[PDB]
UniProtKB/Swiss-Prot annotation:
It comes from Saccharomyces cerevisiae (strain ATCC 204508 / S288c) (Baker's yeast). The SPX domain has very high affinity for inositol polyphosphates, such as myo-inositol hexakisphosphate and 5-diphospho-myo-inositol pentakisphosphate (5-InsP7), and moderate affinity for inorganic pyrophosphate. Its affinity for inorganic phosphate is 2 to 3 orders of magnitude lower. SPX domains may integrate inositol pyrophosphates (PP-InsP)-dependent signaling to adapt cytosolic phosphate concentrations to different metabolic situations. This is Vacuolar transporter chaperone complex subunit 4. The chain holds residues 195 to 480 of 721 of the full protein. Catalytic subunit of the vacuolar transporter chaperone (VTC) complex. The VTC complex acts as a vacuolar polyphosphate polymerase that catalyzes the synthesis of inorganic polyphosphate (polyP) via transfer of phosphate from ATP to a growing polyP chain, releasing ADP. VTC exposes its catalytic domain VTC4 to the cytosol, where the growing polyP chain winds through a tunnel-shaped pocket, integrating cytoplasmic polymer synthesis with polyP membrane translocation. Belongs to the VTC4 family.
Amino acid sequence: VRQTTKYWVHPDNITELKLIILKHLPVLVFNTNKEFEREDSAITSIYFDNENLDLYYGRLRKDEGAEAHRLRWYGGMSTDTIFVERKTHREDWTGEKSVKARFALKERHVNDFLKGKYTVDQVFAKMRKEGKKPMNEIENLEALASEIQYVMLKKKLRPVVRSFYNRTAFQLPGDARVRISLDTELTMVREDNFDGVDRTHKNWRRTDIGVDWPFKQLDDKDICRFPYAVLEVKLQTQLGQEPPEWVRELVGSHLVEPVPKFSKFIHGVATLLNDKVDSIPFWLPQ
């Protein structure tokens, strides 16, 4: 049985919270000398929606099958691999869950792919040629890309909001019993042109910022500097036991504030496009 929960963490409780976790879990690092630079922690996502904000409303109301679409990269602006990600909301008798699917695209192909000029076949030509991945897996990835490209064109999606944050990942590899992420410097930035400002100049992302938090060059109206860290806890508890006592103690402690449905996408839209949206998540006033 797997459970996911999200919490806010006041800046005054961040260090103390880290000390508790690191007592039990290692931090993942991605260089072999186990040294890391400032940009290594960065994760940036460009969320797409249309001018009616169809996707925002779908995710807000938690419609069955409501999709969120985002283009994500890890690290700094030299990063060339862009993840085209789709999150789907699911509900049934067993309860709730989030389903994520993604495929990878070189940066220089992104615009052209989104316009339907660069086809899915073209996208996966090198992958098929290589013969590394089994054919069925390739055909299923291509179906994913076709579905995403179709919605993008069909619903006229465009860049709307960017989330940026630094993520620390606490996890002992090959052990999913407990996985914890702490996101700091959380920021949302406008990427839309809804007020007539062509923020991306028809690129898939603005280029007047990189990962240079705190992004002092942005106009105040374009940015939301979130005050709290966001903590996410992914448990895979073996039926029919309970989650580790240190995990339970932690989540129930004064250190964290549970915000079950929290969503950086939804927070960004509601905060930055406040005069435009007609419904608001319940972690915000009304």
